[PDB]
Nucleic acid binder design. Sequence first.
RNA 1: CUAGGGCCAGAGGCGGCCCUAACAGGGCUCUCCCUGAGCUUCGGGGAGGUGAGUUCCCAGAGAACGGGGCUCCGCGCGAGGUCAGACUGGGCAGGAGAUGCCGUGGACCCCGCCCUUCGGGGAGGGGCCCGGCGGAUGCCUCCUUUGCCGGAGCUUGGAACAGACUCACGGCCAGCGAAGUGAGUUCAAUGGCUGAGGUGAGGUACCCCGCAGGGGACCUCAUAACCCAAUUCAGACUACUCUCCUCCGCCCAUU
RNA 2: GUUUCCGUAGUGUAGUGGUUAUCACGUUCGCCUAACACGCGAAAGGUCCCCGGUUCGAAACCGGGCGGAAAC
Lengths: 121, 145, 182
Amino acid sequence: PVKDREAFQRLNFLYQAAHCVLAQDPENQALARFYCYTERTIAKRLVLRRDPSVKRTLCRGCSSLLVPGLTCTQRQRRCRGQRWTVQTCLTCQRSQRFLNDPGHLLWGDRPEAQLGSQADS
Amino acid sequence: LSARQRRELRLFDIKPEQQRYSLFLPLHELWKQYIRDLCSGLKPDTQPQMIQAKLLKADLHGAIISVTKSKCPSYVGITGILLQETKHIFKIITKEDRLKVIPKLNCVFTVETDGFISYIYGSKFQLRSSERSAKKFKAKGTIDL
Amino acid sequence: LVVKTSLNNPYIIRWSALESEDMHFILQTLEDRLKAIGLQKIEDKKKKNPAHVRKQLAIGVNEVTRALERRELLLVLVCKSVKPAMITSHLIQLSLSRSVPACQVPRLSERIAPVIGLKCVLALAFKKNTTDFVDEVRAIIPRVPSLSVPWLQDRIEDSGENLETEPLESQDRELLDTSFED
RNA sequence: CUAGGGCCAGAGGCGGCCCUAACAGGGCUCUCCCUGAGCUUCGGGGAGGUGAGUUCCCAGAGAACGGGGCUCCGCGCGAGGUCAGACUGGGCAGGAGAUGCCGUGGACCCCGCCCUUCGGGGAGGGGCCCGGCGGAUGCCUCCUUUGCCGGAGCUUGGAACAGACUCACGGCCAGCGAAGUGAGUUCAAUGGCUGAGGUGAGGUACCCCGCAGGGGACCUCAUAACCCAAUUCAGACUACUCUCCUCCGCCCAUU
RNA sequence: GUUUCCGUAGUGUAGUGGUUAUCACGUUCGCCUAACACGCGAAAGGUCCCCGGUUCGAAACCGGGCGGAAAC
Ligand SMILES: [Zn+2]
């Protein structure tokens, strides 16, 4: 994390720059796609382990980081057993499965909330 | 995965060309606070060799440029901030709405910081700028301009 | 020592203010209006043997998510009964364009049961364009607190950025999970 | 000494096709991946078969399989009530989505037409998944639950009918010291000079043809860079501009 | 003409059958001595010859371009 510390600033800058385009003018999303495509490529070559909370919004088909949150369809339904929150865009038509349930809040606090109590300085 | 990401293109359209270029200033304002958060020392005497070395791998998206030298006389003197950045071209948008494409073939760009001015010779800086931050910027040749 | 530096950015988009003195009696005001006008909602569904049915009461999660898309001025009421509800309720915060996302955390689960209705509804909303239902509820909308979103722009040409790098340690999960593969 | 050949084990042979004894050759074409300033029906680069093996740490049910974590389900097994539909009575499921509908999505099951009569190829339907739109009843008729067995899902991650790479798709056997290469040197010859042309710019007090135009004559200048034969030839790859042909991009200016 | 091998702090060289850059010499400092040669610890010092490509990540694997070296 000496030389790799510089690399963290170059990833969240292009992530935030795609939000500034869509905050001022929506329905023209070519800047939000390229800023996410450059963000994924730097993390692909310079290997970094990003959080699954942000990465589940990037919509790993090609690139859309903010587009399914305000334009596309994200709903709840029950396919076979437990209910699933299906995140599907309108460009590559790929889906991401995420189950929402009170029986597995202990496992729902396992990837994200366990690092909030164990990652010490 | 190759043609499926390239169905229409990731290219612009006709309607985002007229998005009132002064509204692209918070993209430049985001970049302006980004450089102050990168080195965090500017004023008294803080290593001008370090400033030109950290901008080698820095993502310069949304930065002001002005062509002071180019092999074409028509390319020299175009000001504006950039939006895309491809292999050996990068698309800029200028004053009152019109976009222009200037290639990175043999030219230099002038980037104005708060208290610094850095020239970027566009003949060595190419080859998919996401990979520019990764690796392989070595010492080769001169830039005869 | 196995320490992996992980860029972890859950930038906390906070909800409205937790004014328990203010957000308690306005829910009792909603019970005074939904009962005095009429309770013919269950009488048309069950048909225990039509003007109250004409409302577009967005009942459920997926009727609220389709409501805020096109062009609708409405009010959003979200409770917190699920602990991983931030996956679901992120659309309430992020779709702030023309609505007010009210979030009654401790009491809204106890507001469906006394009303003659159905089981525990998570997301409650209603479309009331070009129809005067209750003029007093429309006065509570500037009275409930709004939430600012620094995720996109927060309405001012001034960005909010941070550097949240949480280094993941393998020795912490070695004592919790105790999983070994050789 | 015809290697358009034989021998031992094999029986497998690199998408298909075509040209060549010049098969780490070229061309046509299909699919996929990587990638580029011609939205892209585009240019460039790489990979296609089968079998075996490998694929960091962490997270994750799982990175070969199985076991083990937890939920859901009953052509299975066991117990209790038997008070086995009463005013459709009883119980379960349901906005935390029941029911219904849509589809050039499936490498899923079945009916099944035609090419065919080995794997199979395409049109169409049902069931089961996938995804989308739209929101209220639906299920069973002695009943309910635990345990066991089977089936399905599982917020990870660069990746989970995978992809990438390595290895293997045979082994082995055949030469002549005799003069002199449209350059033939080997302590390693040879792309020379001058003058006149060609083509590519520029000019005319010059001539002819008479359509303002064109041709001829004369004068000035560019003709290179990369590089060197050593037995020879075909092909691939790489280093190139005095030049010509094809395909375009960017920006300036004009209408 | 012919064949194989090599390029790694300043030199000589390992290493890796792909995710970390180091051992010996020398320098600096430290240990030690009235001040020392040895022993010993530690630090400064990286275009891992160059580009492309494969892969999640090439000092490495592959392809090309040079370079260097061993001998008839
Ligand atoms: Zn998409």
